[PDB]
Design a protein around this ligand. Sequence first.
Ligand SMILES: *[C@@H]1O[C@H](CO)[C@@H](O)[C@H](O)[C@H]1NC(C)=O
Ligand SMILES: *[C@@H]1O[C@H](CO)[C@@H](O)[C@H](O)[C@H]1NC(C)=O
Ligand SMILES: *[C@@H]1O[C@H](CO)[C@@H](O)[C@H](O)[C@H]1NC(C)=O
Ligand SMILES: [Ca+2]
Length: 463
Amino acid sequence: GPNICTTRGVSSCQQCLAVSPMCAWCSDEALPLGSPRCDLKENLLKDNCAPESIEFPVSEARVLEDRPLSDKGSGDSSQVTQVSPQRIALRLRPDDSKNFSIQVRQVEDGNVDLVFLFDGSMSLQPDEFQKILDFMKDVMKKLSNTSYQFAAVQFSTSYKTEFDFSDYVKWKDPDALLKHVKHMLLLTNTFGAINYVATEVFREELGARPDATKVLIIITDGEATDSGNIDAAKDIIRYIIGIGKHFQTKESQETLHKFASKPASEFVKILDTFEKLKDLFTELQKKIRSKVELEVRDLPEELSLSFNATCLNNEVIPGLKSCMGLKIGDTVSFSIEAKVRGCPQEKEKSFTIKPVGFKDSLIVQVTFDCDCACQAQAEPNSHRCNNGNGTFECGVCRCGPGWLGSQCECSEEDYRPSQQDECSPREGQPVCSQRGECLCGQCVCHSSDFGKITGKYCETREL
Ligand SMILES: *[C@@H]1O[C@H](CO)[C@@H](O)[C@H](O)[C@H]1NC(C)=O
Ligand SMILES: *[C@@H]1O[C@H](CO)[C@@H](O)[C@H](O)[C@H]1NC(C)=O
Ligand SMILES: *[C@@H]1O[C@H](CO)[C@@H](O)[C@H](O)[C@H]1NC(C)=O
Ligand SMILES: [Ca+2]
């Protein structure tokens, strides 16, 4: 009962390895004409194929950079390790996959870049617009002396940065930052206003931090008067907050989903009164820096994935990518499996796994292992496979054009040997009628300088 490695009918060592991650290849050169070269290292060894002649690579994962996770006695030297390990060298066989783990622990509180994109349309009364202003100031007042950094972009018809991160980091004065704020009293171009924040506000030269969390807090009282797409703000955590008379219907409050992040059950917050703005943020603030979601970057196309997350109390949740509801010092762990489809050419690839809002990341160097090591003495068209006709790599003949078979002989063949008794009419009879050899199961006739024997079984010397 030969299994998959044998039964694939392989022609080279590189294809035997590509059968399955379990298969192995023999290359003993001086072996019988019939003994499957592709098998397992045990079944292959029950036939004597020598030690060093068997080609069998194995996938492996090795941990390179494995800094230990930081502690509560935090002293910023080489910063603080929040993800470990950081560098792992993977080596994969054709259609192979092995597993490895990662551990995340927010030893720092968490750096956040938050932007108040608040409506200023003609629908707001001066009191509620002030309440929206008092909402922003109150948010920034109890979040000073944290790792937060704030901006604010009033919008209506036009879009105006009231202050950006370089201002806040300098002053840390909520009232004096938003004291210049004047009510626009116009329309609601939410699409263009959201693009403004993604392209003009989150700029590093305006106090932005390239490793912090991108958080948008959209506060609106009605539906958008413009139209477009917010694809520029696809990597920003967006909270939209429709408020008031113009979201009393379930229809009108569903429009904000296209702006809000997903799931919209979490990132859409409909209010009937501007007074509820006070309590609304004290609960969003509990869902901002409390979830670690892994982020796969620059992933090669031929790499598959898998995840087994261990979140709260050893809750092994397969598939999951994020563990939420964490505090300072809590540690999580994720087990990951990476499969490959075949064998890409690219000798070395490198992709990053990093939690969102963090700078510590896991970088994976994947070097594929497909080619065999018996290419030393590949030998194009060797003396063993007849000259000019067959490469003798890894103990077998990879014949060129027209020629096939063992020592390269087949002309235009029959597309398998199968029953080798095609060369004679009956059991107790010589093969080829004693005028030729049984090449590839069919009887080819011996041409001589005198007569030519044109016929199956080599019978009629035509002269
Ligand atoms: C700021 O917070 C730190 C703790 O992180 C504390 O030691 C310090 O006294 C605080 N200062 C002010 C002005 O809030
Ligand atoms: C996760 O667990 C499932 C079930 O035990 C298993 O099939 C899968 O290979 C595991 N994956 C990883 C990456 O641990
Ligand atoms: C090898 O095959 C080619 C045709 O494919 C033929 O011309 C050549 O003669 C063959 N080699 C020998 C040694 O006969
Ligand atoms: Ca409005």
